[PDB]
Design a protein around this ligand. Structure first.
Ligand SMILES: [Mg+2]
Ligand SMILES: [Mg+2]
Ligand SMILES: [Mg+2]
Ligand SMILES: [Mg+2]
Ligand SMILES: [Mg+2]
Ligand SMILES: [Mg+2]
Lengths: 441, 441, 441
């Protein structure tokens, strides 16, 4: 941990001159304030103010004044090998009267963790597996369509030192103290997955966000463009954020049970059942982009269906073979464009709803695959994820659990943002139409 | 502070070789004289002479001789990391007979501060929030139309070190001793806002001017073009230069009053009424360019209407939630192209007129927004700012307070400059006309 | 004249295969319907229907159905030297219930002529002098900035046969049966003026419309672009439509009076006074474009002032030396972009208002020119035309005569149209601003 005097002493020690008071909006894109070192004490006083309405995004209509409250435990200094070092602080947003802002994703996640703690579970161990694409840039600095390499799954194509981005990312994140479990080449050319070691929910989300920032910074440094867009190119597999989760009460993994046939406790079964039931509802927040539902198509490992299995090509919930303290539930649908705070919050809230209601877990699927008909698919009771973003929004509104989890104020603004996005998308005239048509009719 | 011997000692020890006897004209552009170190003593003697008529601008008809009187308290040295260091002095302009020149903006501001002091208020705490644009340059060194980045409001788009101008400018300004409250990305792509900590009026204006010079210089160093043009591109938000002002009387903020419902003293309300009544008159100076009134259009946060509110999308005056010694008056219409000396002078003079006349403050506007009709708009008593520069000039001439504040000599020359500018602008034939017409007629 | 059987017989003789049922909207642009010859009889039955709301322009909100009633006396056939010859018919617009449409400019002019006849004056002899610009086209067919020739005022620069458009226009208008008084080269390079012989008001307006159509058609044929935009290029003189007008009562020119000192009867003086008083009001309709008020600037023969003179550089009304049946009033301000029906209607309505009210004609101006001051300008009682479109619109609304002449329905739609145009124009950011600014600020 850290304290105010510790921060001041470290700033004096490291010659920190530049401070990034960080936070995030509902849209997920990293937001901040840049501060000189001479204001650091005032920063530690919980007194810095800013617009505040930026949380509502580009649809902000009325201005506010909102204060930044840093979390000292998240202090870190970037290793950018230059004089005038830069420091990072991750902050929460507070109203002028002192109460928390309802619409802050970190506030949402912490509220859901509080309501989890009230249920007796101390923490939620979360480990993500984000993948990113690197594209060669042009002379003006924009990404082109050609990838950085042409290797296959789990390859060594980015070898040597020439534009070896992956090694640089691993080393810088390690020097930042983040626990990197693995790093490797993913299915499509130019796709790199970075595995995190498991950590607490809030700090795991902070790890994901700082991961995105650092990966992009390094990519710009090597003359490449780093993108998390869930399906950048047609015909190649997209980017997934399989998240491994497990509940903890007093450093005890509640999911483990040697008496179970699969070694999964009843609490884990209720958790996964609750995740399954509200899956279509939570898709709108865990798959937030219009592009994301382009990735949920057959033939690219993408899980398009809601059923649980220990091992199958496309189930909603995968239960790994690791047991004991490492037994866990892997939810594979969410993608790197999704907000980690909101995604984890809705996952956990739906899971605790399932736990409280003691929902009956449906049977797992065998090696059986989903070439079956829709009549056969519904005969076995296997629903599917929403086809596109509009159905996801309608399901979100019709769902009374995750709407409560997001909160009344944030729900309206996120719904408005997604309505505007979808309205813009649906009225476009794409080139594919002019290819198919413009000659046939 | 500083003295003559201190200045000489600092120049000797710091190896200062180059001196900028610096001041401003009515047009606002930074003017100066370059001097070698060997004349520094003569510079400290208040004996340097120059044309003097440069204050009148490009319409000077008869030549004068006017002496530069430096203000030693504003001495500073530029840190450009090179041998043969350069030094800055901010000077006032004096007639050969010793009397002050009537047309100097700094002289105008100091005269208005003197007439404020005669009213019992010791000083005016002023903190600006200017914004500037970065445009990528071409091979020949001219600004192009494409911005440097594409981030949203309060973003972290300019990350890393590659052409990261925000960190470098903040650090250089801090090495000047500048009190930088914040620095962040603004609403449009490529728009950067720098927040200053509060300071005295004359020092605040000097801070704004040296701030502009510093930002433009650093942009040149990074191969970028820095502009304050109030509306550089159609369809994007322009530049705002909100000034937060508050009267100080012997380390006492006269505006604060715990007995008030909103925490504004009667003197504060008189200030509000005085600024509101003469708003249309002062717009001609605080919005000097023809382009500025292109920014005062609906839909881009631009306040187009004269009414006061604690929180609204577009009122004349915003009163922040901060209270106590930090209660303030944020006037939002003035833009960075406006001369800070003249803008602050006219604001304070109109406000002091309101204070003396004890003008009755009209009611604030609620969350009600301004889709309401013009007949209703005048029914509710909500006037609007002048549509363009010509009406602003006519209102300025018809106003008997602001014309007095600028002074008889300076008023004529400012009016002549703006008449020439508007006459040049109105007779042009722009490309938009040839787009709409040249085919329809 | 002509009749139904005459039209059918001529169509049989000339092998007319293509009919243009012509008309005009409030915008002035030529509109029509194309019909095959086999429907010609139905066309002569006044039974053809169309949208009708096209008269309101692009601001049409509710759809109608309106019938075309041709005027057989305006039948004419184009001499385009090709098989499958084409014929022209000029039509009025009628409601489905049989009543005239209020918003038709031809209907407006005919109503004003009817109210003139009710005053005892049989007709209005009108002869225009429109000028047009010819620009060289590029490869894709768009006009460039370079003119066709570089001759001076009244020149022979467009000589020979190579792209000698003026002769072609004169010859085709003569085969049209239109009476061409003269044709010559105008002040700026590339400007050709075509003088019409005098005709009745409605037929004169039809002559102007078909004149524009034929000139543009010929220019497209010669690989040139014909434009009537009043001030296409800065620094060159604009395009004017000096209109000569005189009232006729039973082939007797009421204006002539040998007893008058200058040979103008009291009726002519009242007419001129009525035109003078409502000049500012009628400018918005006789100078409709935003570009037109760019032409009303000093130094290019453009009349910018409301005063009458027999001979001066820039009076509102010019009285030529020709007398007897050739006495006339020449109104010089209206431009070729202005609707001829509307301009003639408002001119005549204001003139008859002056005649009825017996307005006292102010004194004429001598060779005195208008380098005199604004204080002098108002001292002599010489008003000026509105500076731009917005002032013209406000004056038009404040006027109770011209608004009545246009009619209640048409006034609202024209006002809305011009408000939209001016609103679009005022919020643009032109290149001239980025030239002056973007470096100075
Ligand atoms: Mg993977
Ligand atoms: Mg996995
Ligand atoms: Mg701002
Ligand atoms: Mg502000
Ligand atoms: Mg002419
Ligand atoms: Mg003439």
């Amino acid at each position: 941990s850290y304290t105010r005097e510790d921060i001041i002493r470290i700033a004096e020690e490291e010659n920190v001159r530049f401070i990034r008071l960080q936070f995030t909006d509902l849209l997920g894109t990293i937001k901040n304030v840049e501060i000189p070192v001479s204001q650091l004490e005032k920063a530690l006083d919980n007194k810095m103010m800013f617009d505040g309405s930026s949380i509502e995004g580009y649809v902000r209509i009325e201005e506010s004044d909102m204060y930044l409250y840093p979390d000292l435990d998240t202090w870190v200094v970037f290793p950018w090998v230059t004089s005038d070092r830069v420091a990072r602080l991750i902050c929460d947003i507070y109203k002028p009267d002192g109460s928390p802002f309802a619409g802050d994703p970190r506030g949402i996640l912490k509220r859901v963790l509080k309501e989890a703690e009230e249920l007796g579970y101390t923490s939620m161990n979360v480990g993500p597996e984000p993948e990113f694409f690197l594209f060669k840039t042009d002379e003006k600095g924009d990404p082109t369509t050609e990838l950085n390499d042409q290797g296959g799954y789990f390859d060594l194509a980015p070898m040597d030192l020439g534009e070896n981005c992956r090694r640089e990312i691993v080393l810088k994140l390690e020097e930042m103290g983040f626990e990197i479990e693995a790093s490797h080449h993913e299915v499509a050319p130019g796709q790199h997955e970075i595995d995190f070691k498991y950590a607490d929910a809030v700090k795991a989300a902070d790890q994901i966000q700082t991961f995105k920032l650092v990966v992009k910074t390094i990519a710009r440094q090597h003359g490449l463009h780093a993108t998390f867009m869930p399906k950048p190119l047609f015909g190649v597999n997209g980017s997934g954020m399989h998240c491994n989760q497990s509940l903890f009460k007093d450093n005890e993994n509640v999911f483990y049970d040697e008496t179970d046939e699969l070694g999964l406790s009843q609490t884990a079964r209720h958790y996964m059942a609750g995740i399954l039931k509200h899956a279509r509802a939570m898709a709108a927040i865990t798959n937030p982009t219009v592009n994301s539902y382009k990735r949920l198509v057959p033939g690219y490992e993408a899980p398009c269906y809601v059923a649980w299995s220990a091992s199958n090509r496309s189930p909603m919930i995968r239960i790994p073979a690791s047991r004991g303290l490492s037994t866990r539930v892997e939810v594979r649908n969410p993608d790197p464009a999704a907000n980690p705070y909101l995604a984890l919050a809705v996952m956990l809230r739906a899971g605790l709803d399932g736990i409280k209601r003691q929902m009956a877990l449906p049977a797992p699927i065998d090696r059986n695959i989903y070439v079956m008909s829709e009549e056969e698919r519904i005969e076995e009771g296997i629903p599917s994820l929403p086809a596109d973003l509009k159905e996801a929004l309608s399901e979100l509104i019709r769902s009374e659990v995750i709407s409560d989890a997001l909160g009344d104020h944030a729900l309206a603004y996120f719904y408005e943002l997604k309505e505007i996005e979808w309205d813009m998308y649906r009225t476009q005239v794409h080139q594919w139409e002019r290819d198919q048509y413009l000659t046939l009719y």
